[PDB]
Symmetry: C2
Subunit: 135 residues, 2 copies
């Protein structure tokens, strides 16, 4: 069950915890160049989205989409990018990223682009609050 | 009836291979990675959350059905799924077969290098194989 679920150490390291939904832990990717969240469904040994039970796939869909709408509202973003890649970290996690023309590497992907710029402490606390107020 | 029309660039860049309930399926004309797009057949949708909730659930079911089928078809180590839409605003979901050693592994296919078109016979064969495995 969910209470014994272990977050992957690299997601632990690279992401700041900002809360849990029902199925998914939410983390703010520690790269302030784009407002970037990850959703980590708290099921053991899941690598592909299709490995989730049907109901968990549904839960993830709507948690993802609630967060995407919320992120867009909180940032004033032109476009959300959603991604389940996992070439690096195999534990299933869904990227939900706020984008706009002129942001770094627009219109290309955030993934693998340049060097992460970490969030100042207080600024990510304020932003986490802002996300939670907009979900 | 729908006024949905496939964006001209997705038409040009993708080779149709079939249709499910919600989504049309195209094979991105870039043989470097086995790369599909699912285009939900709903008028003027940009974000996943602009679909009705039933369509959102359907998009996930179809995306995951295709992801499972593409893995089987390709022996992929990993499937990558992306709904980006910075270049083509029309909602479409990329579903991509990956493996160690493939071009730009482990990074993204999007924006990497120059597309290598599929030979005619090869994409026909590959399309049948995807459809067999869904």
């Amino acid at each position: 069950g969910m209470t014994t679920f272990t977050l992957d150490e690299r997601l632990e390291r690279d992401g700041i915890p900002i809360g849990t939904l029902g199925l998914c832990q939410m983390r703010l990717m520690n790269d302030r160049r784009w407002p970037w969240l990850i959703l980590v469904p708290q099921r053991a040994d899941i690598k592909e989205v299709f490995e989730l039970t049907p109901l968990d796939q549904a839960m993830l869909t709507f948690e993802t989409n609630l967060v995407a709408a919320g992120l867009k509202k909180a940032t004033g973003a032109e476009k959300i990018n959603i991604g389940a890649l996992g070439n690096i970290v195999r534990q299933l996690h869904v990227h939900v990223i706020a984008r706009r023309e002129g942001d770094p590497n627009w219109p290309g992907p955030v993934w693998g682009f340049g060097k992460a710029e970490p969030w100042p402490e207080e600024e990510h606390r304020t932003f986490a609050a802002r996300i939670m107020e907009n979900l």
